[PDB]
Design a protein around this ligand. Sequence first.
Ligand SMILES: [Zn+2]
Lengths: 33, 107, 400, 49, 50
Amino acid sequence: APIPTVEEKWRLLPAFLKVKGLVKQHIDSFNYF
Amino acid sequence: MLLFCPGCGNGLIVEEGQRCHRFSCNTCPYVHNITRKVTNRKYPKLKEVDDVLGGAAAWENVDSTAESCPKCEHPRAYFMQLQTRSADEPMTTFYKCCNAQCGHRWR
Amino acid sequence: DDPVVQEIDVYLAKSLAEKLYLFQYPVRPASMTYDDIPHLSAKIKPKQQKVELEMAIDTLNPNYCRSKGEQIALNVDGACADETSTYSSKLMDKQTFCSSQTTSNTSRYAAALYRQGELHLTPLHGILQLRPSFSYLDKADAKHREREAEQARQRRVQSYEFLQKKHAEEPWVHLHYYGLRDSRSEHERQYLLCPGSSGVENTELVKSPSEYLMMLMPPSQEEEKDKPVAPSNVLSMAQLRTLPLADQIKILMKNVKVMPFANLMSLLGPSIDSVAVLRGIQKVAMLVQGNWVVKSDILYPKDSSSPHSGVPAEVLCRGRDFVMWKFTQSRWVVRKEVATVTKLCAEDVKDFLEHMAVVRINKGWEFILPYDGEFIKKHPDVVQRQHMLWTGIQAKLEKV
Amino acid sequence: CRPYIIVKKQKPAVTNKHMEELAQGYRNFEDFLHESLVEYLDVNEENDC
Amino acid sequence: GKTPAEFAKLNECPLDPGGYFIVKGVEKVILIQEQLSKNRIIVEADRKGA
Ligand SMILES: [Zn+2]
């Protein structure tokens, strides 16, 4: 039987990109220091 | 196998100074007198015996039965086999064949 | 899995709370019991607890090699001085051990005595490890060697001989030994059993499993250096206790613009009063077509300005007030050219309607969610209170 | 580290309802973390699963 | 924390990534550095095979 699909999975990515992700490493490290 | 002294916990040594050999310590007078025989060694070490009898050596080891090749089956290679390393590991077999201008030696 | 058998009880004996020690010999097998050989002498110190033990050894039996014993004696003790010889005879009369500490605190360790139908515990006062003492070679070395022949910042706290001196301050105490063969041992062993009724309800251990979980696991931070003002996105799903229910409501409304009433109770939970929340809802959200919608000023405070990537301008909440007035007047809005009356730039129109509505091909914009039965809930008064509040707002709004 | 969705007994932890909630805006990424729906794996730890 | 409207008065681009320094009026970036762990038992064979 075909397992049910969660079509919207990919929407977890934009939220992650909002709170963390690209070019946030330098900002977070400098803030912490 | 190794031994340590019950009294002091260091390694024993073997020596003779009286009618009978003795297992003794080097720091305390504890000793045991060996009256019997123990049967386990440290597996000593001497290197590869290859050319003990290299080349067309004596003919006492001749034997009757032999195998044959799958391709050509010419009349000259009688059997031989050999060993790997030590007293507690297997022994191997190789079928090497050699007339000219090739490279054969089957495992 | 029901309890099957041997549902035995447990008991605590305080008779020996400070009197109990556990002694372990790493260097000797468990089968090689020490009980047989006669013990001779021992020493103890109460603080920085350590002990020394002196042990008889047979010299006549064959396994003692007498000659080497005599050589060791001559090497370790004076030839004929013998005033303070380590041995009374000219051979090894005895051998000694040294103790070692294992841990500072031992609270979480308890000895136990099992018995048919009962089991008795006892707190341990300390654990120590014993090892054979090799100081006698050092004594022999010393005897051979004697036969041969504005102060800077203190650092003595870290030097070993300071600890030796600290430990030397403590006087020695000696103790009379009694072996397992002595009936005195069974006499002492009587004290482990504690008397009392077999069935008693313990007064202590009152804490419930709930209390025990955070008891053994205290909060990581005893006090946080900052307060959860929650201006930005936070943990909306967990109803923060420190956040007042009116502030919670304001945060949900800030986070998300339009929902039916039933969601409020779905998210706040049945524990929250369904009536009291009306006061906050009326303070912060108005119902349109039966569905509550947030205020414009909450989303665009008068201090703020046009944030979007279009044209900067004063914070015209009235533009939002226009689109919601239209949506109260009609189910859907086909008026593509609101900018003619609002006079605002186009991106404002798409931005406001993106908040409020959904695009329909060749039919402008329509309500994002269906009509709801606003009279199912028994509040006709607030429905009317919205009706003439918006009538007055519209009358004021007509001016532009 | 990387985030992954957690699977138990062959059914994912996350379900369309959650994605609907997230899209509408009830909750946010960090919410999925407390509720044990996603977790951060690390190179030494993703060697095990 | 500024909005797009306010950036323009500052002569800055909204889409700019940020995360870099300005020293003597030139844009400097500190690159991420990679190195092996500390405090581990590494087992290895010498150049002679030992
Ligand atoms: Zn010894």
